[PDB]
Write a protein that binds this DNA or RNA. Structure first.
Length: 224
DNA sequence: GTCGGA
């Protein structure tokens, strides 16, 4: 997962997590309005610190000083809990990135066709993220990654990997600072939303170019 | 110390 839509108001997403969570984030009624959220930008990220929830703009990408290559944007759930690189993020930098759905590109030959993937029941998604804390320091190299998992069922037909999406109840547990890395691994294993809860459709190729914006990017298209 | 298009 390297592109998604986060277009609604923050209250719209937070209300699915809990009554209290929505009250605990300062009021900002503006729809986030982003139909083409791309790595290397700052993205509103939900987390907990000092027993309080926070929604901060955080760089999507992770590139510590000692990392000579371009920023990572994903971390594999298979190994992130024990990775030399991601272990500290799994333990102390868990977060949630909400979204309306995400884009995946199917490589039908030498070209790519984008699909928008969303919950069949019309709810937004909560993607599991890990990152560098303190998140609020506006670091532009040490941000967050979206945790990935193996594509299951029909998603396998689009791409071999997928974001780890948590149910709202799991998303709330994921963010708790007092839990073990092992508890987090069990939340990730127990709270993942399987492919049969999603629908998807092809969308215009225009989304691939980050310059393109607007609700059209997620509309279904005929020709593929 | 690892994994999107353009």
């Amino acid at each position: 997962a390297g592109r998604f839509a986060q277009s609604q108001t923050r209250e719209d997403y937070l209300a699915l997590l809990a009554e209290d969570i929505e009250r605990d984030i300062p009021y900002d009624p503006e729809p986030i309005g982003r139909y083409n959220v791309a790595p290397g930008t700052k993205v509103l990220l939900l987390s907990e610190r000092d027993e309080h929830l926070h929604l901060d703009p955080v760089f999507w990408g992770y590139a510590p000083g000692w990392w000579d290559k371009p920023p990572l944007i994903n971390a594999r759930v298979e190994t992130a809990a024990t990775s030399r690189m991601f272990k500290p993020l799994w333990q102390h930098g868990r977060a949630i990135c909400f979204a309306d759905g995400w884009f995946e590109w199917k490589k039908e030959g030498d070209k790519k066709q984008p699909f928008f993937i969303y919950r069949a029941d019309g709810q937004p998604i909560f993607m599991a993220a890990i990152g560098s804390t303190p998140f609020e320091r506006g670091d532009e190299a040490e941000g967050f990654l979206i945790v990935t998992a193996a594509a299951d069922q029909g998603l396998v037909d689009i791409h071999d990997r997928r974001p780890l999406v948590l149910s709202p109840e799991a998303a709330r547990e994921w963010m708790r600072q007092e839990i073990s890395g092992k508890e987090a691994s069990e939340i990730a294993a127990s709270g993942c939303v399987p492919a049969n809860q999603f629908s998807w459709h092809p969308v215009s190729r225009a989304v691939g170019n980050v310059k393109n914006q607007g609700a059209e990017l997620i509309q279904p298209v005929l020709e593929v």
